[PDB]
Amino acid sequence: SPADKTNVKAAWGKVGAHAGEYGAEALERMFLSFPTTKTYFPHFDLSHGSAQVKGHGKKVADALTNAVAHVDDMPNALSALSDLHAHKLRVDPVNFKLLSHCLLVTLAAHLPAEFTPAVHASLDKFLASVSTVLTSK
């Protein structure tokens, strides 16, 4: 909805320079809560301080800022990521639900004033729309 797009842009726009920190936290939350997700990263250091998890967190978070900026046009904007996640990596669509949940948990923990019920709803819809695109092929 138009109100969903407004709520996502407002909430996500207040991530700012913490993008990499939050992406890395979300990944860590996922790897500890749902350990089957670790098999997609067989050659990563997944220990708590990892430079590799922080670098990867930044990429994930920056792809989400790009999805925010192209909300109306996501199949086209995330095209190469759909290639990667669906055609090359073959990621089970369950895992997108799992990361989406860990992203919301991360935003709830860091931006409590922003994470109202309406914003939670909007963010949840947005992350599901990003996940269909990424698994769509």
């Binding site: 809560s33 949940h101 309406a118």
Partner: protein
Amino acid sequence: VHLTPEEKSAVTALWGKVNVDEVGGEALGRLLVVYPWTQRFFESFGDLSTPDAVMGNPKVKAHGKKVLGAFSDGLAHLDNLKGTFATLSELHCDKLHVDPENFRLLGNVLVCVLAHHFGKEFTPPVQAAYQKVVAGVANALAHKYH
């Protein structure tokens, strides 16, 4: 559900700070806003037409309290969730006809509310322990459907 001793006392420690009353109604309210088909089960609760109406509805609050009380029974009996929830599993299936996927959704909404309240203190290892618990609760509630 198999928790380590470490995990067990992190869960118990965090739950001691939970306002029994208020979190249940927040969790239940967010379920009804984020997953609106769940409102079908609560038509007699009155006004649910907007997020603010849902969160400020006194029946959502009062029913929230009951839901969260059953979660606390769970935490007290982690080696016996199926037994603890046996009568409630019956009720949700035979009497209310709730699809069990909805049990998983509430559990995760409750996780988001805990994170919302506790911020930094809801660390990733603490989340992991709670995810085992709410999965165990959802599975136990689904047990008498089969």
